[PDB]
Amino acid sequence: MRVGIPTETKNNEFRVAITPAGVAELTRRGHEVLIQAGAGEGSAITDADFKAAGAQLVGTADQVWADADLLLKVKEPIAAEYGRLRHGQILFTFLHLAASRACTDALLDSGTTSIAYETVQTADGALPLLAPMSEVAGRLAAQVGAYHLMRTQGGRGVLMGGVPGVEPADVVVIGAGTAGYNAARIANGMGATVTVLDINIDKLRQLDAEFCGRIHTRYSSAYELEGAVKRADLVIGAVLVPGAKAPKLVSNSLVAHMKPGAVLVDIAIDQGGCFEGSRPTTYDHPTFAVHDTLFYCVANMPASVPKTSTYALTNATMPYVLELADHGWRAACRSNPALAKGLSTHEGALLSERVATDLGVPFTEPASVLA
Amino acid sequence: MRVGIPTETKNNEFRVAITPAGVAELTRRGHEVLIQAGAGEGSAITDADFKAAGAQLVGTADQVWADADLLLKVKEPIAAEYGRLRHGQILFTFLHLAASRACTDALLDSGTTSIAYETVQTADGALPLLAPMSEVAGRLAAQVGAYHLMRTQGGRGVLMGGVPGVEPADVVVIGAGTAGYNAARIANGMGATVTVLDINIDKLRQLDAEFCGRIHTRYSSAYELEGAVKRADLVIGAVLVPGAKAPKLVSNSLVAHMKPGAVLVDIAIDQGGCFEGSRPTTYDHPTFAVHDTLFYCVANMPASVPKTSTYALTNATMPYVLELADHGWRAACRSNPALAKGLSTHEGALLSERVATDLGVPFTEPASVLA
Amino acid sequence: MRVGIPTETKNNEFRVAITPAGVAELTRRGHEVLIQAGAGEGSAITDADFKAAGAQLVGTADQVWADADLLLKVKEPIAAEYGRLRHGQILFTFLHLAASRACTDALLDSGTTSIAYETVQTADGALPLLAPMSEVAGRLAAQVGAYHLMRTQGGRGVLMGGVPGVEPADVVVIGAGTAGYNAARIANGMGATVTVLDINIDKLRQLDAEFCGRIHTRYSSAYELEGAVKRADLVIGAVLVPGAKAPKLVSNSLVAHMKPGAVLVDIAIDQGGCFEGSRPTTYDHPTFAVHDTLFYCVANMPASVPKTSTYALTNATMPYVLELADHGWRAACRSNPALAKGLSTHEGALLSERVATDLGVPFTEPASVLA
Amino acid sequence: MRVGIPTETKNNEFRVAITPAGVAELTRRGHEVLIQAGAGEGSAITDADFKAAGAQLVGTADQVWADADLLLKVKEPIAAEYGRLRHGQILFTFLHLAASRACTDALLDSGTTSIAYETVQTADGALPLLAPMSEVAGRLAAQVGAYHLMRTQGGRGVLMGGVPGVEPADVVVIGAGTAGYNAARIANGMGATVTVLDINIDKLRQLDAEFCGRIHTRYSSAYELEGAVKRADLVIGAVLVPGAKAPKLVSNSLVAHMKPGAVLVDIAIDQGGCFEGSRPTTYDHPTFAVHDTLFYCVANMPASVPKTSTYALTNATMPYVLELADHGWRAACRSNPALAKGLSTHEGALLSERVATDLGVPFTEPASVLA
Amino acid sequence: MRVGIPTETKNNEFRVAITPAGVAELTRRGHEVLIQAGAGEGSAITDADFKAAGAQLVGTADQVWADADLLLKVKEPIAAEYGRLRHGQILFTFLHLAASRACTDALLDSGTTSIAYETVQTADGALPLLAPMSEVAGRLAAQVGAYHLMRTQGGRGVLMGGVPGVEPADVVVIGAGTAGYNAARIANGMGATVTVLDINIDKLRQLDAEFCGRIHTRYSSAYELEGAVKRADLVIGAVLVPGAKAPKLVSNSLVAHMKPGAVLVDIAIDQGGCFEGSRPTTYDHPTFAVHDTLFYCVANMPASVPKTSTYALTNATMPYVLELADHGWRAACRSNPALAKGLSTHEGALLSERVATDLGVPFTEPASVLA
Known part of the structure; x- marks a missing residue:
């Protein structure tokens, strides 16, 4: 053959x-x-x-x-x-x-x-x-987020890990599956303070074990989600539904309450996205504004590495x-x-x-x- | 007053x-x-x-x-x-x-x-x-390097940390001072394998202790430097000579021998640069080609965060x-x-x-x- | 002899x-x-x-x-x-x-x-x-703070390290000398999120390297200190000036803005204390209230171990x-x-x-x- | 509704x-x-x-x-x-x-x-x-044991983590389930040397991997248990049998051979205790003596945080x-x-x-x- | 020239x-x-x-x-x-x-x-x-000790790291300088439980910080040294007196009280040795008995790598x-x-x-x- x-x-x-x-x-x-x-x-x-x-x-x-x-x-x-x-x-x-x-x-x-x-x-x-693609995208998300947080790109202008004496970036990862774990791991490694949100407490238990105290974990009620996203410099949407549509977890009215310059990365963009303001973008035009924040929604991300x-x-x-x-x-x-x-x-x-x-x-x- | x-x-x-x-x-x-x-x-x-x-x-x-x-x-x-x-x-x-x-x-x-x-x-x-600007620069260098490593930006198209089963990026950092320590630390946090080169062994001892085995160290003879640069996906120039002009440590012919798509970030760019091909760039036109590799030489980098x-x-x-x-x-x-x-x-x-x-x-x- | x-x-x-x-x-x-x-x-x-x-x-x-x-x-x-x-x-x-x-x-x-x-x-x-006594006191402070944060002792009732899904305690350590280093280390070990404040950036740089991202560091301006203290569940005063009298860094008015049930531990109590409300206490009556907060000021602490x-x-x-x-x-x-x-x-x-x-x-x- | x-x-x-x-x-x-x-x-x-x-x-x-x-x-x-x-x-x-x-x-x-x-x-x-109550209990046990280990409370007067040059506390945790895991993790975090005993080697393997060498593991034969308990400064009983009665694993004659001032914390107190000498205590009278050792058997421990x-x-x-x-x-x-x-x-x-x-x-x- | x-x-x-x-x-x-x-x-x-x-x-x-x-x-x-x-x-x-x-x-x-x-x-x-030769010797000492601890070589027959449920080896390192630090580090990495003795508490402080709890430190009185040695499966003599003759810190009557099969490695053998029974050996006949213990005293050890x-x-x-x-x-x-x-x-x-x-x-x- x-x-x-x-x-x-x-x-x-x-x-x-x-x-x-x-x-x-x-x-x-x-x-x-x-x-x-x-x-x-x-x-x-x-x-x-x-x-x-x-x-x-x-x-x-x-x-x-x-x-x-x-x-x-x-x-x-x-x-x-x-x-x-x-x-x-x-x-x-x-x-x-x-x-x-x-x-x-x-x-x-x-x-x-x-x-x-x-x-x-x-x-x-x-x-x-699919699993390998999710690993790639999770790790990529942390990288692109970090870059687009520079003022030069329209972001709030905070360094992932701060420097001694100065606060690091506050990062939230929504979803504790393969993509979310991988984004969290890399953001953490860059020195940001990372909190991951999921409704599956066993998944949160794994994350807690693996990093001892380092990666914070929070039960994802709408109420706790709002509170976390409100304070974030970077939000990474990593709720990938295996073969369905991907729920819209972050509303445009919630983004209207985020800090100016915050960036949101939608890893779930192929298959629908998981922010309501989400829309597929391209390599040459990767971001766009929504109420003072910057969205990054490049389709087909694993192709860039x-x-x-x-x-x-x-x-x-x-x-x-x-x-x-x-x-x-x-x-x-x-x-x-x-x-x-x-x-x-x-x-x-x-x-x-x-x-x-x-x-x-x-x-x-x-x-x-x-x- | x-x-x-x-x-x-x-x-x-x-x-x-x-x-x-x-x-x-x-x-x-x-x-x-x-x-x-x-x-x-x-x-x-x-x-x-x-x-x-x-x-x-x-x-x-x-x-x-x-x-x-x-x-x-x-x-x-x-x-x-x-x-x-x-x-x-x-x-x-x-x-x-x-x-x-x-x-x-x-x-x-x-x-x-x-x-x-x-x-x-x-x-x-x-x-x-100056020290805090060196901390910022060093940590920045790893983030910009990782980003411009994407095929999408002209780089070789390798993810810093790899994913299981696949090799991570090979990163070399030249200089073990404040800038170089910081570059090394952030790149290592992103999962890349990192080697730092310096002529001061005591500085290499500190890096060795701090990371146990994780960050590799190499004595910086021209012969050893060429060997390490030839294999790198990402090279960070971090030799900041405090008030003089900064030695030219990577020559153009040496860059002619690097992997296609490699990226070189010159943190020493204000005060002269430390690659021979170095030349100040701007935020909207940050990189340029030298022999099949990509140079990143943005002046005044601390200002972007x-x-x-x-x-x-x-x-x-x-x-x-x-x-x-x-x-x-x-x-x-x-x-x-x-x-x-x-x-x-x-x-x-x-x-x-x-x-x-x-x-x-x-x-x-x-x-x-x-x- | x-x-x-x-x-x-x-x-x-x-x-x-x-x-x-x-x-x-x-x-x-x-x-x-x-x-x-x-x-x-x-x-x-x-x-x-x-x-x-x-x-x-x-x-x-x-x-x-x-x-x-x-x-x-x-x-x-x-x-x-x-x-x-x-x-x-x-x-x-x-x-x-x-x-x-x-x-x-x-x-x-x-x-x-x-x-x-x-x-x-x-x-x-x-x-x-004196150094070994400060090592002991620093380590002890985190232990005692953890215990007195129980509601049963009058504290706000938060576990130092949280549990998966739930926030850990927010701990600030004022002073990054031997006692502060040691208090921060044990607090961190217990799973709390720890910030240390000091005016000497080099000491913040040591703390930052030793724990990679893990222990947060903040420059100690009054402005920054007030912000940190207001959010704290546990505050540990660890500014021991060599042989003088120890500055009063937390004022009573400041304490009046703290979360009810927060606990403050003054390791500088021998030699004056460094909170304004501070006053030597004894092993049988170790704490006392100051506006809804709990102070712990036991004199001669190293003797308890x-x-x-x-x-x-x-x-x-x-x-x-x-x-x-x-x-x-x-x-x-x-x-x-x-x-x-x-x-x-x-x-x-x-x-x-x-x-x-x-x-x-x-x-x-x-x-x-x-x- | x-x-x-x-x-x-x-x-x-x-x-x-x-x-x-x-x-x-x-x-x-x-x-x-x-x-x-x-x-x-x-x-x-x-x-x-x-x-x-x-x-x-x-x-x-x-x-x-x-x-x-x-x-x-x-x-x-x-x-x-x-x-x-x-x-x-x-x-x-x-x-x-x-x-x-x-x-x-x-x-x-x-x-x-x-x-x-x-x-x-x-x-x-x-x-x-029940799981989250176990996590709380296990984490608590390490904090209360640390506290009661001070001479001031009747314990033998050793600091959990020692200080340089001086031995830390010897802690033994009986049981490698959720409570045991969490007590061992906090105790280790506080610098103590921790051994956990269980009859399930798979559970010992997980502890071994999680902390690399850090937390010692020992197979729980009565002989091996006797040896560990005799040398311990702090013992944490964490064998919570599902919905049965909890076996009595430490007998009073065994406690008679322990170091004077040793403290024993029974997390399995609700549901029977797992020391022979165990008996429910209250928050104001938390401990009692059993042959020169100190038992801590507070019922309903999660209520305190x-x-x-x-x-x-x-x-x-x-x-x-x-x-x-x-x-x-x-x-x-x-x-x-x-x-x-x-x-x-x-x-x-x-x-x-x-x-x-x-x-x-x-x-x-x-x-x-x-x- | x-x-x-x-x-x-x-x-x-x-x-x-x-x-x-x-x-x-x-x-x-x-x-x-x-x-x-x-x-x-x-x-x-x-x-x-x-x-x-x-x-x-x-x-x-x-x-x-x-x-x-x-x-x-x-x-x-x-x-x-x-x-x-x-x-x-x-x-x-x-x-x-x-x-x-x-x-x-x-x-x-x-x-x-x-x-x-x-x-x-x-x-x-x-x-x-000399420094780099001390680094080599210290790292080697842990490897050679681990090897000769097999029964097959005459040693007590314990694996450095144990296996889950089974005690690891007990290693003592005498001397906290460059060689002792390096021996300690490697032994620790093999999973052994390691105690280092020195008279210099500052050196003990560095080791304590570097490994958090992991590497135990003890003040080196004769009384303390004896206690440590008696319990050891492996002892590494690492006190290199810069250009003098190296003190004899372990006596033959002390070795007479060590466990059968214990192995003692003398890094200080060039320049005199630091055990009383020490005596330069060769690569093909590397060890020799002293009362039921095994001494390893190969001269010129750095030459073997x-x-x-x-x-x-x-x-x-x-x-x-x-x-x-x-x-x-x-x-x-x-x-x-x-x-x-x-x-x-x-x-x-x-x-x-x-x-x-x-x-x-x-x-x-x-x-x-x-x-």
Whole structure:
């Protein structure tokens, strides 16, 4: 079986769906790896690095998409790529079909068999392909917040960690999951005083243990949330609902009461955001004002640290990549129920319940497509 | 005696030379404090805050400059201000007279008696009024470095701390003084692996103790420095030679050998920089390319976190301010040798030898202006 | 030469001026050590422990006082002991002659040559026999503060460290010398959020490095001190000026604005206190109300942990004791300038300037008593 | 539906069963919250604070008890209160029906439907409403032990953390559950050397990892326990068996071999104690002697830090309170099996097996009262 | 001026007196560096590494010795090398002339001008060239002790850190200087419980601060030392008397009371040892019994980690090496009093007081040889 990786075509997407390490593993199992020349450049992986590990470099996208039995991507197929989708081809990538009827149509139209990173789910309910992205975004949030708190960028102009004799920044992190833990850890390391809000006290218990006294924790009643946000220099919204909408926890009237220059970072912005004033922004125009505060809501944040996030994602996808390549999609899916939860599309059929219901019509077919 | 504080007029200087804390102290001792309406805004100190503490708010610059016996500033007098300099007036601020013959001429012409923050020196050779700006700079450097490391900003695209399974950034800090210690500490807090280089082993011993194994230390031979810089994702230049010009420790050919996308932050940029390719940049155009790497050389960096730096500076100046207001300049200088080392100008006389020699002519008069 | 240690007679003084370790040292050098039977009991040192180390147990106080050439105590001679003072006898203890007209007269009268622990001072200005007592007091202050913050004792009823989800206590420590450092450390260890205030930024810099972010530091302007105190659940006064009287840093009006039930602990109570409402209390009636707040001002605090303080004090005194035993007082004092600073009394003469120049007349006689 | 909270009547019970945060939640869901004036005083919550959050302040206890559909308390109804129990009313508090036949009678007699905090149990066997009381207790134990270790209180007179050069206290904690973990953590924070004993090595592994070497762990054989206890200055009994009686792990003959002045704190006192010599004490007479050691056995310890323990408890109860208020008891109990395990009384029937079987007769009625 | 480095000839001396780093610095200032082929192999530095940095490789010892103006070594000249000593040549190495009249004779005879690493001393009394060897020795002592504590090696058979539920090893370190601090640090990191003894309480204070509670400190009376030693699984003797003979602090009768299998490591073995039973051993026969305990007394311990210790040493020597190379010996010595302290020999004259008045006759000549 033949495996192909095209350059990501979306604007400001710098990741690639495989690294030399992954190339090496597939090659040693006798699969052939076709990589579009230039595909790893945004992530600082050169064509030489890919060649060294056994890949065949190929000049054009067209030639990757025709030719590959398994196609690995990072983002969903873009308009210009709809034409390339094929019949006897397994496509594995972030799909988010619910957010694009156009995309879903193109997939079932071409009769492509597709599997979504975001709905691969282990028996304990974990989504192992999203987890690494949440780690990245959590850690990033602390960094971008710190920078945008400079007066020079419109922020209140406080240094994260103060200096001896002077108060550090007061940071609140809403949500104690993977993203929230990671944002808290990095803000803390920068010397800010950090309080995390959650309604799950066991999650707060973990945070309390891990840092002894250092990271403060507070039970997240609306009343305690208001009080904390009112005093914050930096607020990080990190309530990521696995596959739903993400609740709006901070209202515009509450922001109207924050200190002038405070900054709010919405890690939940893909999938809806969790401040009410939230709206997706771009790399060149990352922030905008809401009543005297600064909002930072860049969509698709993990893409800004591609050397890190390419490895983070492909380390997690690798085992699943290997199973597909060795066994083909049915079989791999029969052997591995986590994988099967990821099945989305096969020869015109829509296999996802949340998507079928949600995206107007088509209608499910459970998985019985696994005869 | 009357004490006046004007808005800083240099662009992108957001600090102010007093806080309410200081205002209250001066009032309690029966001095009158004159503050230019709006002076504290960049530092998020309102007129009301200043009023509350006992200050008299004044509508124009001219009114503060005439009226004040002791005039407190952050930066040196700008061209537009030369007109306001007076005869029986003590001016206390960062002067950097060596950098400007125009400024020095305006000072001795007007016969004003001036004391420089940056040459106030205690018996042990410390410069207590620069130290807090070095703390700010060092901590800032790590944050700006981390941010500009994003692909989105032209950097290699690596997250400071990595995420589990993925390597963190390799950060090297050149110089183990106040600035370098602080850079190292914040970068280490963000999860990066950090190596600091210095020729003073005792300073390396302190860093080793403070962090147990965590912060690596290396003796700074040219050979060792080249080796460490060649591997770095992030390099911080923190060699601040206290009143001289700062050695050029990273050469352009050495930068030609660094990883593509590496970022170099030069905290030594005021006073000359310590990379060969260094050149002062501005807040809106902070970086530029040198051979495939990105240089960050923003002058006057402490000014971008004005809420923090105003307090860090004014807490350090306050005891000198109080001694001046209570006793007048001679006497304060006779009592306090550290303050005396700051004496620059009095009634046309230039009192600083480093300056007099350096600045072509005028010629010293030691201090016997203290009859 | 013969060394004697009487039981401490002042009430609730539980320490003893030597341990078996010290007795053994003295014995090995061929001195005779006379100990009043029962002397070590408050400090959980039994007569058998003393005997095992070479001491001679002796039934009565009188027999220790006559017979000993060098007399070691912890506190000053009490009224009932004035009769026991002798002429060819060195007395070494905490004296505080300043505080007792009567005591000074007694010592002069009897012609006793006496050396005070608290004015023994090294070339660098350290007071090495007081330091261990400040360590003890600092650590104790946090313990007592925690306890009296219980509602059951009259305090506002907050646990030092909170529990997950709930705020810890807000603790401010005024003073960053040895006592303040130690109080802050233990408070922090208990999980409280701790801020220390001081006017010496270098001491704030040490505290900041030692705990990375963990212990907050604030420059001690009255303005800043008032803000910190108003928010505090526990305030610990730890400004011990070397040998003067201790400034009053918290006013009664200030206390009237504090949270009801807040507790204030004045470690500076011996030697004056540093709150205005402060007044010496005793172990059985340790606290008293001041406007809805609770003050804790127990005098002589190190005595409440005698097993620790006995050792702390006597480890510090030991080398001075050995010098005096081996060489007699002059010679010991000529050899050792730190010891000579402790000289207080000899053959009717008063040898201390601060005390002569404070306790009305007698008049100094510098030290020339060392012919 | 209408929710009522009476002042706590039991002597030295300072908590209150709701906070403003909880009142706010209930109010926004359109429920009526009746609070007896003064109810929050012990916990430093004013009637103003309650009224701001939407509460109806009510002058008498009887006014709350009639009028309230759901009645929230902290402790069991006392003698004086039995008259107030009603038919169509849900009572939610700490019951301990096992320990009072009288109580139980009153409950079934008045036909009140009551649910007990301490039997609410999640599928995994956790008792989430007891947990926060354990955390408080464990943390408290370390503070009270420290205090009573002073000679002034009868203890042997050692400071928890020692001071440089002098040994710290030897603390042993029996039991590695939530209370044990929290006592050990605070004791260690105060600088003492801490050993914890348990028969569950997994729990010892967690302590080991959490503090790296810092907290010592020892397997709890009687032999090993004997050895540890004999050397300890402070012993904390923290073995809280779920809802049974708590084993007697330290016998009186063993205490006879302990160091004079050692202090033993029994957190397991409510529910029986775990020292043989243990006996409930009160806040004004907290300790008593057992062979030259000091026992501390204050019942109801969490009440002494009411500001902390009120929030800790009510954060944990809140989501149950909301389910009851919104759904009524049947339905809430159908919906939520953890709640159901708490069911103790309804219209004369006794619903708890452990109490039916243990409190002589009445006899169970499983839960079928949920028709 | 030309600089030569011979292979070290002493058995089991693996270090070399320069690294590539050093070669490069020298070369850049226009000095030619002669290195004997093979010199760096013991320290894992190849001839290629040295060549790449500018060195001239030379086949024979004789050729380096004749030809070099400045000769750099690690150890003192051995018998077989006496013949190679020259007239107009500066020799810079560890000499320890007091330990060998033969060696001293050879140096004076040949008229060589020699400077000892061990007596280079800075104004503050530091010996900067021994310090790094003390760091190495202290760190090594913990490793070797841990190893020989296995039964397999004759030790008591305890693991340094224990495992959960099982006691770790009890380690005592005598001496709180650079070596003892480093031994303490590593032992602690291995999980052992560590007590350090010293007479200097300030040194104990530093250790207490640095590790919070973690590393125990005890005042070093004989009485206290005995108690500590009796209980120890491992004792490390770390009292390095700067240039004297090192006190014998552990007696053979004391070792007779230690636990069977205990191991004692004497870092002070070069220079005399600090245990009574101590006796220099060799790498292949490293240990020996003294009453049921194991002594470990390998001479010249830093030589066993030559990759580490070459760098540690040559980093410290480098600035001195550059001053000599650039200025010649007189002048370097006149500019640099620390260097002048090292002067030992010139043209038949013996220039060291301690050595002359210790090594029978010759007689000093202060330094007047600097005309």
